[PDB]
């Protein structure tokens, strides 16, 4: 509360570390469904169903331009990618399995880096 604060965590490396995690996810061989925005004109159903589209290149652009106020807002966009994937894709599909794999890959990096 006013004039009463927990000891100050060093956050000066967060921007660089999030960038490294995102790089490692961009180069995973199961990244291909997530590299670019889903084409809303070519994929029937997607625009109406998926209210907040998100993908790795959009995340990279936001990160590089100071549009994430902190650690948590970055992780929320990453999770949003895989939440969208689950909504639109059957678990038993190549893209469905790619989503599950990438989420697991992300959460491990996240834990080891910050938690
Ligand atoms: C995460 N990706 C998707 O949910 C979808 S839906 C249709 C697609 C695609 O990824 C790119 C190939 O075409």
UniProtKB/Swiss-Prot annotation:
Per UniProt, residues of the Bromo domain are 9-113
The record's tissue-specificity note reads:
Expressed at varying levels in several tissues, whereas a smaller transcript was expressed specifically in testis.
Q: Which residues cross the membrane?
A: none
Where does this one sit in the cell?
Nucleus
Protein family membership: Belongs to the WAL family.
* Known role: Regulatory subunit of the ATP-dependent BRF-1 and BRF-5 ISWI chromatin remodeling complexes, which form ordered nucleosome arrays on chromatin and facilitate access to DNA during DNA-templated processes such as DNA replication, transcription, and repair. Both complexes regulate the spacing of nucleosomes along the chromatin and have the ability to slide mononucleosomes to the center of a DNA template. The BRF-1 ISWI chromatin remodeling complex has a lower ATP hydrolysis rate than the BRF-5 ISWI chromatin remodeling complex.
Which proteins does it associate with, and in what oligomeric form?
Answer: Component of the BRF-1 ISWI chromatin remodeling complex, at least composed of SMARCA1 and BAZ2B, which regulates the spacing of histone octamers on the DNA template to facilitate access to DNA. Within the BRF-1 ISWI chromatin remodeling complex interacts with SMARCA1; the interaction is direct. Component of the BRF-5 ISWI chromatin remodeling complex, at least composed of SMARCA5/SNF2H and BAZ2B, which regulates the spacing of histone octamers on the DNA template to facilitate access to DNA.
Any idea what this protein is called? Bromodomain adjacent to zinc finger domain protein 2B
In which organism is this protein found?
A: Homo sapiens (Human)
Q: Which gene encodes it?
A: BAZ2B
What stretch of the whole protein does this chain cover? 2054 to 2166 of 2168
